Design a protein around this ligand. Structure first.
Ligand SMILES: O=C1C[C@@H](C(=O)NCC(=O)N(c2ccccc2)c2ccccc2)c2ccccc21
Ligand SMILES: O=C1C[C@@H](C(=O)NCC(=O)N(c2ccccc2)c2ccccc2)c2ccccc21
Lengths: 301, 306
């Protein structure tokens, strides 16, 4: 019983964090096997960012210009290359603490744990969702660049986010570990902005189920709805559409509580229109959308 | 920018978790040097818990009646002893992943991270507070007993909590690592229940300071209050009394933001009496009390661990 914002244990990722220095800049990197991954903007000065030619900037760098340190030890850099917006530093030692891992690109709505680091050392761990507008709402300061986001499933780390920049609105932008940005962002100095955001409907439904597992019931009503009618209401209130896959993914929580998916949608429908009436669900006065149906199953069953 | 409920990195603690099995019961243990610490209720059958005589139960166990496993390697038990509500199993090898560590007893209102574990395998980590009523509002299922709570101080893990039971309201009770319970709970089947709880005032104020640091300023107003006047309103909404010590420890956040402590109390007074009128603070439509003053400073100043 209980329901908390729970992160993955971070130890397998802590064993991969390093510090990467190129000239006057230091940021974080991720050491897997004999490669260190970090944002390619490490190689840029402030003046370079106005109009960078990353391929030329990198031609003017050599292996010796990159200082890589794992705790107190310098790694020898023996090669360098760029894949999209990620720099890959080859080093002469494979990380002995390399976990089982994969790189995955996640969809909006999906959650992960962030290990916020500075200078290759950890500050803390917390859960984030990829927003529909491809930002995350993290907690990050200068020098957090190169911190990563991940999930852990049957002993295997799936890295899905590398942190690159904070946007003027105070939210965060980055890439997958193949170096492709999430959303319309770029690693140079230009006006760029996140669009309008929406609420992750399937996550809100998963959280309602969680509330029912923990004994909340007051929002269940006597009504039902169709998927198409629910989606008409959702759009008015800037909620993402709910798809049949979503319904299917919510099956297990449906099974466990007795509450048909469309009946829970009928509950949300009334909440979207009429609000929470001064009431709380699982410790909150707003509808929470950063728990997936898998986050809920993991903690509640 | 941003302000999250941030847990400690858990790697130093993950390397200490093991499984302990006695009869049909399996729960988690903490392996530090050549000792394994776990709840002593591991030695009890369901029959025994009505009125356990732990020293009579324990004297009847042999070393070989305990099965301790690190992963799927057996740690042979070579000695046992009880200290308060914790069992200490001496084992035949020292954990080579033992971090620097200390046992510390925390006070109510203080915060720590829980590493929730099942069958000796960590499943996740979250940050929570010790409630005024000495419970924790954790997230735990059957099997979680022996899971621990901790803080990190530079390179040192300060262990503060070991999980023993869920009470009937769905909150959590346990001990320090010397096996003394927080609060008036006991490790037997009783009708014990969670006493009346309050909101941790100082922590709410700390989080309003976090909000200001992050640019969320709408609840700042032109009024002030005295400490005594404030406490009258605190009493009515079931908030802990604010003391001059609490006022002192908000000193640094006050200095950083330029908002006097008693002006921030004036802002909270108004939020209590009026509510939020539809608005949010740091993404919440409720007043949050699980960040301490030091927690705000640590996150906002990018403190790391070694
Ligand atoms: O969460 C973060 C990470 C950090 C950040 O935003 N880094 C970005 C950054 O430093 N640059 C850059 C700038 C000048 C030379 C080279 C790179 C940048 C610029 C444009 C596009 C992409 C990268 C930060 C700073 C202050 C507060 C919060 C935070
Ligand atoms: O958060 C937890 C941990 C788990 C718990 O509360 N276990 C308690 C428990 O197993 N016993 C006991 C019982 C029979 C023999 C021996 C011990 C118990 C009884 C009284 C006093 C203290 C210990 C649990 C069960 C359900 C949901 C959530 C949770």
């Amino acid at each position: 019983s209980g329901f908390r914002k729970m992160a993955f244990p971070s130890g397998k990722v802590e064993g991969c964090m390093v510090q990467v220095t190129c000239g006057t800049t230091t940021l974080n990197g991720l050491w897997l096997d004999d490669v260190v991954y970090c944002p390619r903007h490490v190689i840029c000065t402030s003046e370079d960012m106005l109009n960078p030619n990353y391929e030329d900037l990198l031609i003017r760098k050599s292996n010796h210009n990159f200082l890589v340190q794992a705790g107190n030890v310098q790694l020898r850099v023996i090669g360098h290359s760029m894949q999209n917006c990620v720099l890959k530093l080859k080093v002469d030692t494979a990380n002995p603490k390399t976990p089982k891992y994969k790189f995955v690109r996640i969809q909006p709505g999906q959650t992960f744990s962030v290990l916020a680091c500075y200078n290759g050392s950890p500050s803390g761990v917390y859960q984030c969702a990829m927003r529909p507008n491809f930002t995350i709402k993290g907690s990050f300061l200068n020098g957090s660049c190169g911190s990563v986001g991940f999930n852990i499933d049957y002993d295997c780390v799936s890295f899905c986010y590398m942190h690159h920049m904070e946007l003027p609105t105070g939210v965060h932008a980055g890439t997958d570990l193949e170096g492709n940005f999430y959303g319309p962002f770029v690693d140079r100095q230009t006006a760029q902005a996140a669009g309008t955001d929406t609420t992750i409907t399937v996550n809100v439904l998963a959280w309602l189920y969680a509330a029912v597992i923990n004994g909340d019931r007051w929002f269940l009503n006597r009504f039902t709805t169709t998927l198409n009618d629910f989606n008409l209401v959702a759009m008015k209130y800037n909620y993402e559409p709910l798809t049949q896959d979503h319904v299917d993914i919510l099956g297990p929580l449906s099974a466990q509580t007795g509450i048909a998916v469309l009946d829970m949608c009928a509950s949300l429908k009334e909440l979207l229109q009429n609000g929470m009436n001064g009431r709380t669900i699982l410790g909150s006065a707003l509808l929470e959308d950063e728990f997936t149906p898998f986050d809920v199953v993991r903690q509640c069953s």
